[PDB]
Symmetry: C2
Subunit: 189 residues, 2 copies
């Protein structure tokens, strides 16, 4: 069974929190690759002024081009939204029967797994990996694998807020991505 880690999110924009987690679990659990699964844009959701999936893909490409082991998974973008993880993992599970997928989540999403659609069936399809800081233990009734990580508490929403409020983004996400954001004036301006 090939071990491939999956990291979901909007990647609007992608940041060192995404890369840090991918690299850590990739090593801790000896995975083959880690795939970044962009979310499809939700309906009604920002049918206003927001990033096109096209720009997210570009930044995501800028952020992962230097790693042969990190690749993009357009599975959720292949269908119209919203995207349920279960349905999504069902498909990757039929396209890649030789793979034991590891769905990776931040320490704080763990308490919300009960609200995920079909979580019990989903736990049959993939093996959940929860990321936590040294010594802190993840509590949940679902089987999860914990991987101690020098966690970076940055997020795409914090980054979007900051680009508008014209705040600092230093050390938060890849420079190449930052250049992309400014050249195209995303969020900022």
């Amino acid at each position: 069974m090939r071990k491939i880690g999956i990291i979901g999110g909007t990647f609007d924009p992608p940041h060192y929190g995404h890369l840090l987690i991918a690299n850590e679990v990739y090593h801790a659990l000896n995975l083959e690759e880690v795939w970044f699964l962009p979310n499809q844009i939700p309906p009604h959701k920002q049918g206003r002024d927001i990033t096109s999936v096209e720009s997210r893909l570009q930044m995501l490409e800028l952020a992962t081009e230097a790693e042969e082991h990190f690749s993009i998974c357009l599975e959720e973008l292949s269908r119209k939204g919203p995207s349920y993880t279960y349905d999504t993992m069902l498909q990757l599970t039929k396209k890649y029967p030789d793979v034991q997928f590891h769905f990776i989540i931040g320490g704080d999403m763990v308490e919300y797994l009960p609200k995920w659609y079909n979580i019990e069936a989903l736990l049959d399809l993939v093996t959940f990996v929860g990321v936590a800081r040294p010594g802190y233990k993840l509590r949940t009734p679902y089987p999860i694998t914990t991987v101690e990580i020098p966690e970076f508490a940055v997020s795409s929403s914090l980054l979007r807020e900051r680009y508008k409020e014209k705040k600092t983004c230093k050390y938060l996400l890849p420079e190449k991505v930052q250049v992309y954001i400014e050249r195209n004036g995303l969020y900022e301006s």
Copy 2:
């Protein structure tokens, strides 16, 4: 007065934990400078090979170069043997009575404040700044200024450990610093 930030530590090695913190608080509280104040490490009697103040100072200089607003304070390295924060601030206060220092510490270090040497006197010399993840509150009996930050839970000790057991260090500390570590074989050979 001109407000200056202070971050103490071994910086053995200096890492992105430190830089992020200084840049986050430098912007949050509008400081005009942040000072990196390296501690003096005494010789472990049961014998333990530790980095020379020489190379640690070079590592500190490597990670501090590019930032005009980041400097090294050599006050603790000027005394023989490690000194208490109180004593160091007594000297910095009298040496720069025009400055109001902001001693920056990790939110998780906050609870241990009551056990600090002369903390009652220290509270009047400097202004404590506790750094924490957004939303988290800093329970403490002392008047601390809290600043929400996308906290990077990396530590010098966690690093010395990755290098020894040959674990990954990616995104954990600056490029130049790793280059210097690899050469002189600081935590390996």
